[PDB]
Design a protein around this ligand. Structure first.
Ligand SMILES: CCCCCCCCCCCCCCCCCC(=O)OC[C@H](COP(=O)([O-])OCC(O)COP(=O)([O-])OC[C@@H](COC(=O)CCCCCCCCCCCCCCCCC)OC(=O)CCCCCCCCCCCCCCCCC)OC(=O)CCCCCCCCCCCCCCCCC
Ligand SMILES: CCCCCCCCCCCCCCCCCC(=O)OC[C@H](COP(=O)([O-])OCC(O)COP(=O)([O-])OC[C@@H](COC(=O)CCCCCCCCCCCCCCCCC)OC(=O)CCCCCCCCCCCCCCCCC)OC(=O)CCCCCCCCCCCCCCCCC
Ligand SMILES: CCCCCCCCCCCCCCCC(=O)OC[C@H]1O[C@H](O[C@@H]2[C@H](O)[C@@H](O)[C@H](O)[C@@H](O[C@H]3O[C@H](CO)[C@@H](O)[C@H](O)[C@@H]3O)[C@@H]2OP(=O)(O)OC[C@@H](COC(=O)CCCCCCCC[C@H](C)CCCCCCCC)OC(=O)CCCCCCCCCCCCCCC)[C@@H](O)[C@@H](O)[C@@H]1O
Ligand SMILES: CC(C)=CCC/C(C)=C/CC/C(C)=C/CC/C(C)=C/CC/C(C)=C\CC/C(C)=C/CC/C(C)=C/CC/C(C)=C/CC/C(C)=C/CC1=C(C)C(=O)c2ccccc2C1=O
Ligand SMILES: CC(C)=CCC/C(C)=C/CC/C(C)=C/CC/C(C)=C\CC/C(C)=C\CC/C(C)=C/CC/C(C)=C\CC/C(C)=C\CC/C(C)=C/CC1=C(C)C(=O)c2ccccc2C1=O
Ligand SMILES: CCCCCCCCCCCCCCCCCC(=O)OC[C@H](COP(=O)(O)OCCN)OC(=O)CCCCCCCCCCCCCCCCC
Ligand code: HEC
Ligand code: HEM
Ligand code: HEM
Ligand SMILES: CCCCCCCCCCCCCC(=O)O[C@H](COC(=O)CCCCCCCCCCC)COP(=O)(O)O
Ligand code: FES
Lengths: 51, 42, 58, 184, 139, 73, 533, 223, 102
């Protein structure tokens, strides 16, 4: 039901298998594992510096 | 109203005689002491 | 006054008590939303589970 | 002569404290009227084999506290310390006695969330127990002040007003003890 | 201080009459019998004035006419030292902060914060009580 | 500063130039405003920055005007 | 017997080394007895406890990153793959009698060591002890504070746990690799490869047990030697000048006081190590790059470093195919703080222009600008430290996490400004409070009603009095002025005796006369000495 | 049992229709649809006391349960009858399974907790703060069935852990670590909340430094 | 170095207060020795081995480390308290002035 709100990045439009998305667990800021994925808000939170 | 504005730290450098509910009025207007007593009751 | 120290204690106790109740606004749930008469069992944990109501009481 | 300002302030505040216990009494009486026949209900089983000796100790603490007042008015600081230390020890026994009774009541199924009777019983007696604990702190603080300076009439006044709070606490317990363990 | 005690006795009589009348008026007319939460407050409201009124009665009968209790008293009659009044103290603000710390802990139900607040309150209250009694340092 | 303003004027460092505090105030508001350039999507924080920057600017301007008119020194 | 032996050994030592003039010159040295002067001893005592407990820990710790399978007594970790560093760390706390107690005391000792330096730094800064001729003494101490933080940071990274491994991965790796031009060269050189490598823990272990503590001990020795030979500053007071020290000699008052203070510090650290759980590594688990936790804060002395990372905005620059991450801001800002802290006395002497010899300390209220600046720095440090703990504060205190970040972000500049204004007014306000006592005496708190109705408060003059009741105003001398009548002895004495029974009246009067006579000549001796000089 | 379904709808009509509607379709901007949620979602949401909610905020917090165990089963059955979904595990007697859900291999559960659960919560499961206003609650009061249902259903912001992603054996091992770590006493003294350096530093400054400074003023002198 | 003030703490001999103060210092030292002896006994005979969750001996093991710090901490702390009291009640009070020559 939320698939219509997905915005694709240039060069990565076909990187998903339907409704399955694969994102790196390493935070781009300092390398901490950012695995606080909220299912409803679709927000991935890094517990080290709150990204 | 019988002390300065603003009052000192201890609120009073002097104290007048208290004989009614209006000591300041009695102090500032001594000539009205007799009138208030006589005209108090209608 | 009769108790100069206790008179000053009332001011600060009141000021910090008032700030605690108002401090419920910064909470995500919000401050108290049940009215100043805080009727029961609306003010109950089941019907008022947020910390804003708890800060209002204390 | 002169009215004791500290005594007047303590007595006036003590009367206000009585209204605080009025709310606690209201909760107990309101729940009692809704019991329907069982007050206290099962499995709560109050025993007088422990409450009575603990209550008598608190009552006896008032007599020793009053003895210290006589020493305080006489100017005998050492006599004041002796009687207040004894009062503190027996006052401490009341807290330990009440705490011991709490453990057995909890183990038998009488808890604050377990029953409505548990709520009115624990908050009414527990808040009084907090007052006893607060009174014990007052005893220690006053006794510590006696070794700081010479025994002055102001120092003796502080001893008297502390005993006023202790007498008020003991009187409140008598009302609570009679209401709970006798008026069932 | 005859008038001071008379004020509380006047309130005592009215509170006692209201508590007795309202208790006896709800026992036979209110639905459910006696209004308990409501009556208990009225009965102990009388006790608030009774305790203060009785103490003021005993105090009045001990001391004679004070300069402020004399209809025609002179200002010079009250000359002399009144007592001790604290000139300054930062302890009261610390007591309020200590009490507020425990209240926040109680509101959010933080056992560690409640314990810290209670310890802070005792420490702050100790400073207030001992402020004008600490002796000079012995080195 | 002199004795009547700071009683312990000769006992230590007691004077700070007003230019440093006035310029620092402007830089304080400038730092608040530039922080709106970020990855946050919400604007509630943006209005808080604007309000604080405006308050700081108003205080700095009020002090500078009072100092210029001679009301305060 | 014993008396003969004392002289026998005493002559034997003197006949060989003649240590008579040197020792007597060390047993006659005078140190002031101010309470704040014992703050630096707490840091010294904590370091000694760290040395003793650290040596014990080195006999059971294996600093290796080689993965092994756990077969110890801890059931919740049987079979879990972990490094030898985490393998022996569990062995110390579980397989060695008293190892957990020693481990907990060592970690608490480190926290006391870091906290004592900060408190001791505050006294040096606010009292002006860093001035001439102690500019280099401040610089040496500043390096000790920097070394202590990094030494402790390498301390809890040794067990190789998931909590500190996450801190290592962020702080030690991501910031280092984010440095411009030569950022990945340092990371590659320090880690011996990519994170986590196989040499980080042994290198950290060596730097933490031999190199950094060796430098700290050398710096402490120079610091203590400089304090001992360049003399100790004293607060202004009766008999206190700028060419003499007032206090007690070393033997025996200072030696007993210093030795007793060491025992009580050890007891406080010993009690806390055996009453509060610190760093429960077994509950933390071995470090894995695929695992993380909320609340990954470092130790309190390093929280301000992590708080700066959280608060600083996402400001990166991408110049011509390159990248400058948000870690460069923290790395540069961290060095700026250390540079400002080390070079503060020179900055102060350049701005104020005061380059004179100073031996008497300044009360913090007498220097409002430095007190305000120090209060501003303390407020900024506290805000940075609490910003690192924002997530736990958000969870416990029911605050939005976005709110906590923005409160610290806006408060990072607003709060230091507010604290500076309050501290500046507070310091100047304290000076006015002292001026009131000088020109009016100590307020006794007794209110007296005059026959005409005037209400006046009895004042106790601190000096000579003029024609009528009002005294002549005294001059401020930089010393604290009494404000409580109880501190002047107006409260008397409760009475000689036990807490429950009184002593005989003759004994009480003799003791109170002896005490009253002792204070009469103790004060007179200072006045006689002060008048002479 | 037709009595159970009718009783559950009878509770729903007076408790849940305000935000979920009469036919469980969900009221827009007030509450989602309950179709397909299953009995496990209702059981967890009611036993934990989370539902019925009272207002819209970042998260509805936990509170004392509004319905007793009998009423939760009726409420769950009514929702289960509409759209199906996961069901709460039960023992032989038909009651909610509590003891049988404890796994026998805690070491596997600890690693699974660290990989999948200790991100939002902490290692000892004390909780954590989410993005904006939201926060992960403490796990020290949840019974094993509540943890199992939370894993099955995925409350407000919690990735749903299906029986395929996490097998019942893995789920049983996960709750074993959660239940064990809650009641294991701290070995080095007081646990200090089990949060890490943050309480350790605060306790240090308020105990060790207060005692050290207070001792110093006792030994030292003023002025 | 010049000592401008030097007097004995108890100029008047044969006083009950002096004997009471002597016992107070001794009591703290005796407490430290008793706690140190307790540390020796606790470290040698108290059950220290780790016990798994749900075991009978888990509670006793949970107090092993806490008892180590309680006995060790109270022992040296009591000795330090007695040493401070001895200096403040028996070591003569002195004030010494030393020329800086800096
Ligand atoms: C609760 C409120 C209790 C205070 C009410 C005071 C009424 C009397 C008026 C008066 O004389 O003021 C004295 C004086 C007023 O200051 P002042 O202007 O300098 O007056 C000059 C007097 O002439 C100088 O007179 P003094 O120096 O000789 O001191 C007189 C004082 C003698 O003071 C003492 O020696 C002992 C009093 C210590 C307070 C007890 C500690 C409370 C902590 C409770 C911890 C357990 C929990 O006597 C009293 O004030 C009566 C107090 C009797 C103890 C009642 C304790 C109730 C606590 C119940 C627990 C719930 O204030 C005090 O000395 C004590 C006041 C305590 C303030 C703290 C209130 C917050 C406590 C929070 C508790 C919640 C814990 C969580
Ligand atoms: C972890 C904790 C680590 C800390 C441990 C070390 C702490 C050191 C702090 C105390 C300072 C040392 C002073 C001291 O107590 O002793 C010096 C003292 C001699 O000093 P002095 O003759 O009074 O005056 C020295 C200057 O002439 C006085 O001249 P001035 O006052 O005009 O100023 C000159 C001063 C100006 O410069 C300074 O202030 C020193 C600069 C420090 C930079 C290094 O430069 C010096 O001469 C300073 C002496 C340098 C040696 C430092 C001694 C400790 C070594 C640690 C340094 C590490 C670096 O030695 C003794 O106490 C003699 C003890 C006799 C031993 C007993 C008999 C032997 C039995 C054999 C049995 C074998 C088994
Ligand atoms: C000279 C000075 C030097 C010496 C100083 C050192 C003194 C240290 C004092 C303490 C020493 C204790 C030693 C024994 C330790 C022990 O054997 O302990 C057992 C267990 O007990 C706790 O289990 C609770 C339950 O039993 C469990 O059932 C429950 O599950 C669990 O709950 C957790 O787990 C759940 C999931 O399971 C979660 O759901 C839940 O949320 C939570 O996480 C509970 O734990 P928790 O709530 O942590 O605390 C609860 C505490 C309540 O707090 C406290 O004591 C707080 C007080 C001390 C803490 C340290 C100080 C901190 C400072 C403040 C933070 C200040 C901050 C203010 C800010 C101001 C400024 C800021 C701007 O009640 C108690 O113990 C009651 C005991 C009271 C003791 C009072 C001390 C006596 C002093 C008397 C002195 C007399 C001397 C006079 C001489 C003359 C946990 O610890 C367990 O791990 C631990 O295993
Ligand atoms: C930079 C940053 C993160 C700041 C933003 C967040 C923020 C605004 C902070 C304050 C949070 C608060 C206090 C919110 C609740 C509402 C409220 C009452 C606040 C304002 C009220 C007000 C203005 C006045 C009332 C009176 C007053 C001024 C006093 C307040 C008293 C209190 C309780 C203050 C402390 C607040 C605070 C931030 C301190 C946290 C202390 C820390 C870091 C401890 C961490 C800690 C934890 C987390 C444990 O679990 C634990 C477990 C066992 C033992 C110890 C601990 C322990 O110490
Ligand atoms: C069981 C277990 C597994 C735990 C781990 C092991 C562990 C942590 C054990 C530690 C045990 C320790 C270290 C014990 C401490 C014992 C101790 C400190 C003293 C015992 C004696 C006592 C308690 C008091 C009464 C006895 C007595 C005679 C007292 C004083 C003794 C005398 C005359 C001299 C002091 C000797 C001493 C032991 C103290 C050291 C103090 C030192 C070295 C400081 C000197 C010093 C100071 C303090 C400065 O301020 C200074 C300022 C500027 C420049 C230089 C200096 C400087 O060098
Ligand atoms: C401060 C208040 C301390 C907390 C008191 C408390 O919550 O204790 C309640 C507790 C009931 O817990 P329960 O779920 O019934 O299980 C107990 C099994 N033994 O056990 C109890 O009922 C103990 C209650 C003791 C009385 C406490 C009185 C507190 C009064 C001030 C509130
Ligand atoms: C962040 C996305 C989380 C992850 C990862 C895990 N949990 Fe969670 N949990 C999270 C939230 C936001 C909530 C509350 C939601 C609400 O509507 O209130 C929870 C709640 C729980 C509970 C309930 C505890 C109680 O109510 O007493 C349990 C038992 C629980 N979660 C367990 C759990 C497990 C086993 C996890 C790993 C598989 C796990 N959680 C991960 C957020 C997040
Ligand atoms: C490991 C770190 C440190 C240790 C062991 C330590 C220890 C000591 C000790 C024991 C003293 C003796 C007098 C006193 O305690 O006041 C002292 C004095 C001093 N310290 Fe520190 N301290 C440390 C950190 C610092 C820091 C961070 C600074 C400055 C930023 C500093 C600067 C000074 C100065 C200037 C003095 C002399 C003060 C005076 O003579 O009055 N030290 N230190
Ligand atoms: C200023 C000096 C020191 C500081 C601040 C310091 C700090 C620390 C800290 C905080 C830890 C973490 C302990 C834990 O997590 O349980 C640690 C561990 C350790 N320290 Fe130190 N330390 C210092 C000196 C020393 C010395 C001198 C030695 C050796 C002689 C040493 C050896 C060790 C060892 C081996 C460990 C790991 C043991 C373990 O974690 O179980 N340290 N240090
Ligand atoms: C392994 C053995 C370790 C021995 C450690 C020292 C024990 C003996 C102490 C010697 C003190 C002699 C005092 C005395 O009165 O004898 C005196 C011997 O002559 C001396 O003064 C020698 C001076 C050397 C003393 C300096 C050495 C360091 C002492 C530090 C003490 C803290 C006797 O003097 P007299 O004849 O009574 O006038
Ligand atoms: S490490 Fe992921 S937010 Fe800084």
């Amino acid at each position: 039901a939320d698939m219509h709100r997905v915005i694709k990045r240039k060069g990565q439009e076909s990187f998903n298998f339907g409704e399955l998305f694969a994102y790196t667990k390493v935070c781009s800021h300092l390398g901490c594992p950012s695995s606080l994925y909220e299912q409803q808000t679709y927000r991935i939170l890094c517990p080290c510096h709150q990204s | 109203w019988a002390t300065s504005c603003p009052p000192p730290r201890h609120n009073f450098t002097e104290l007048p005689r208290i004989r009614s509910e209006r000591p300041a009025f009695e102090l500032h207007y001594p000539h009205m002491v007799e009138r208030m007593r006589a005209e108090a009751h209608v | 006054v009769a108790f100069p120290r206790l008179n000053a204690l009332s001011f600060w106790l009141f000021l910090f008590g008032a700030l605690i109740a108002i401090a419920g606004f910064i909470t995500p749930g919000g401050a108290a939303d049940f009215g100043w008469t805080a009727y029961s069992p609306l003010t109950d944990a089941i019907h008022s589970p947020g910390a804003g109501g708890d800060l209002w009481i204390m | 002569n002169r009215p004791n300002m500290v005594s007047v302030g303590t007595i006036v505040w003590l009367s206000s404290e009585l209204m605080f216990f009025a709310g606690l009494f209201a909760m107990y009486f309101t729940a009692r009227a809704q019991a329907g026949g069982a007050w206290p209900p099962e499995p709560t089983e109050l025993n007088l084999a422990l409450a009575v000796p603990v209550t008598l100790v608190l009552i006896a603490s008032s007599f020793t506290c009053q003895m210290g007042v006589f020493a305080a008015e006489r100017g005998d600081v050492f006599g004041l310390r002796r009687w207040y230390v004894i009062t503190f020890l027996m006052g401490l026994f009341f807290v330990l006695g009440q705490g011991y009774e709490y453990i057995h009541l909890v183990e038998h199924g009488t808890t604050i969330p377990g029953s409505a009777y548990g709520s009115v019983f624990y908050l009414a007696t527990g808040f009084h127990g907090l007052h006893v604990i607060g009174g014990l702190v007052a005893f220690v603080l006053l006794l510590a002040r006696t070794k700081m300076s010479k025994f002055t009439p102001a120092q003796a006044t502080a001893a008297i007003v502390v005993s006023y709070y202790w007498h008020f606490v003991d009187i409140v317990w008598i009302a609570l003890f009679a209401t709970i363990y006798f008026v069932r | 201080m005859h008038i001071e005690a008379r004020l509380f006795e006047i309130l005592t009589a009215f509170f006692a009459l209201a508590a007795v009348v309202y208790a006896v008026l709800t026992a036979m007319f209110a639905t459910g019998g006696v209004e308990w939460a409501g009556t208990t407050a009225l009965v102990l409201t009388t006790g608030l004035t009774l305790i203060t009124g009785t103490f003021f009665r005993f105090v009045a009968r001990r001391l004679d006419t004070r300069p402020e209790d004399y209809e025609d008293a002179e200002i010079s009659d009250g000359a002399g030292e009144l007592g001790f009044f604290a000139p300054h103290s930062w302890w009261p603000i610390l007591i309020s902060l200590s009490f507020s710390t425990a209240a926040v802990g109680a509101a959010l139900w933080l056992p560690w914060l409640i314990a810290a607040g209670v310890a802070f309150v005792i420490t702050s209250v100790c400073g207030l009580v001992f402020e004008y009694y600490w002796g000079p340092e012995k080195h | 500063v002199d004795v009547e303003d700071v009683p312990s004027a000769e006992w230590g460092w007691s004077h700070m130039p007003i230019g440093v505090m006035h310029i620092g105030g402007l830089l304080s508001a400038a730092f608040l405003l530039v922080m709106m350039r970020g990855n946050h999507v919400g604007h509630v924080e943006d209005w808080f920055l604007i309000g604080f920057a405006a308050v700081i600017v108003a205080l700095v301007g009020r002090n500078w005007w009072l100092r210029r008119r001679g009301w305060i020194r | 017997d014993f008396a003969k032996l004392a002289a026998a050994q005493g002559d034997a030592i003197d006949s060989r080394y003649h240590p008579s003039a040197a020792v007597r010159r060390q047993l006659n040295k005078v140190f002031p007895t101010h309470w704040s002067f014992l703050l630096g001893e707490i840091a010294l005592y904590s370091f000694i406890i760290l040395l003793l407990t650290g040596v014990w820990l080195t006999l059971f710790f294996d600093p290796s990153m080689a993965h092994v399978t756990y077969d110890g007594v801890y059931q919740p970790l049987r079979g879990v793959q972990m490094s030898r560093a985490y393998e022996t760390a569990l062995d110390i706390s579980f397989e060695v009698r008293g190892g957990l107690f020693v481990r907990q005391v060592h970690h608490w000792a480190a926290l006391m060591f870091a906290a004592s330096i900060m408190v001791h730094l505050a006294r040096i800064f606010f009292t002006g002890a860093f001035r001439r001729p102690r500019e280099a003494n401040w610089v040496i101490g500043s390096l000790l504070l920097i070394l202590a933080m990094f030494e402790g940071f390498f301390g809890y990274s040794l067990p190789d746990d998931l909590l500190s491994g996450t801190g290592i991965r962020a702080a030690l790796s991501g910031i280092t690799m984010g440095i411009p031009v030569i950022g990945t060269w340092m990371h590659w050189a320090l880690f011996g490869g990519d994170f986590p490598g196989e040499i980080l823990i042994p290198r950290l272990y060596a730097l933490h047990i031999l190199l950094i503590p060796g430098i700290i001990l050398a710096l402490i020795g120079a610091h203590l030697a400089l304090v001992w030979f360049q003399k100790h500053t004293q607060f202004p007071g009766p008999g206190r000048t700028e060419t003499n020290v007032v206090g007690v000699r070393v033997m025996p008052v200072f030696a007993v006081k210093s030795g007793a203070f060491f025992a009580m510090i050890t007891g406080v650290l010993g009690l806390m190590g055996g009453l509060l759980t610190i760093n429960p590594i077994w509950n933390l688990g071995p470090y894995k790059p695929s695992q993380v936790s909320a609340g990954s804060q470092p130790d309190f002395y390093m929280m301000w470093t992590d708080g700066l990372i959280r608060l600083w905005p996402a400001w990166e620059f991408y110049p011509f195919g390159h990248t400058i991450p948000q870690g460069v801001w923290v790395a540069v800002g961290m060095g700026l703080v250390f540079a400002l802290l080390i070079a503060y006395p020179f900055i102060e002497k350049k701005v104020t222009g005061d380059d004179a010899h100073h031996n008497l300390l300044q009360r913090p209220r007498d220097v409002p600008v430095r007190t305000a600046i120090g209060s501003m720095a303390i407020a900024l440090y506290l805000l940075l430290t609490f910003a690192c703990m924002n997530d736990i504060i958000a969870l416990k205190f029911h605050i939005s996490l976005n709110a906590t970040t923005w409160i610290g972000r806006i408060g990072m500049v607003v709060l230091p400004a507010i604290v500076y204004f309050v501290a500046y007014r507070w310091a100047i306000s304290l000076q006015r409070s002292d001026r009131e006592v000088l020109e009016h005496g100590v307020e006794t708190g007794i209110i007296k009603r005059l026959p005409h109705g005037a209400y006046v408060e009895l004042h106790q003059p601190l000096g000579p009095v003029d024609e009528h009741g009002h005294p002549i105003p005294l001059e401020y001398a930089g010393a604290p002025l009494p404000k409580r009548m109880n501190k002047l002895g107006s409260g008397g004495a409760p009475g000689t005796g036990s807490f429950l029974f009184p002593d005989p009246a003759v004994e009480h009067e003799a003791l109170t006369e002896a005490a009253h006579a002792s204070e009469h000549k103790s004060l007179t001796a200072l006045k006689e000495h002060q008048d002479r000089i | 049992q037709s009595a159970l379904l009718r009783t559950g709808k009878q509770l729903f009509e007076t408790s849940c229709v305000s935000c979920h509607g009469a036919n469980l379709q969900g009221v827009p901007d007030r509450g989602p649809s309950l179709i397909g949620t299953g009995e496990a979602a209702v059981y967890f949401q009611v036993s934990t006391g989370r539902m019925p909610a009272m207002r819209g905020e970042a998260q509805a917090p936990s509170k004392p349960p509004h319905f007793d165990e009998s009423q939760i089963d009726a409420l769950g059955a009514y929702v289960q009858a509409n759209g199906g979904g996961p069901t709460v595990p039960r023992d032989d007697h038909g009651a909610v399974a509590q003891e049988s859900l404890i796994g026998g291999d805690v070491a596997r559960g600890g690693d699974l907790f660290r990989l999948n659960c200790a991100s939002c919560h902490n290692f000892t499961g004390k909780g954590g703060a989410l993005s904006s206003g939201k926060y992960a609650p403490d796990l020290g009061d949840a019974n094993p069935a509540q943890i199992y249902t939370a894993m099955l259903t995925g409350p407000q912001n919690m990735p749903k852990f299906s029986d395929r992603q996490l097998t019942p054996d893995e789920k049983r091992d996960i709750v074993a670590y959660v239940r064990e770590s809650a009641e294991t006493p701290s070995y080095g003294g007081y646990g200090l909340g089990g949060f890490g350096p943050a309480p350790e530093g605060m306790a240090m400054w308020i105990i060790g430094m207060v005692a050290a400074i207070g001792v110093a003023m006792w030994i030292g002198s003023r002025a | 170095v010049e000592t401008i003030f030097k007097e004995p703490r108890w100029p008047v001999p044969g006083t009950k207060a002096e004997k009471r103060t002597e016992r107070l210092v001794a009591y703290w030292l005796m407490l430290g020795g008793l706690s140190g002896l307790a540390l020796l006994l606790v470290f040698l005979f108290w059950p220290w081995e780790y016990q798994p969750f749900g075991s009978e001996g888990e509670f006793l093991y949970s107090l092993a480390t806490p008892l180590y710090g309680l006995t060790f901490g109270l022992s040296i702390l009591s000795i330090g308290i007695g040493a401070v009291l001895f200096q403040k009640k028996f070591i003569p009070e002195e004030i010494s002035v030393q020329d800086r020559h800096d």
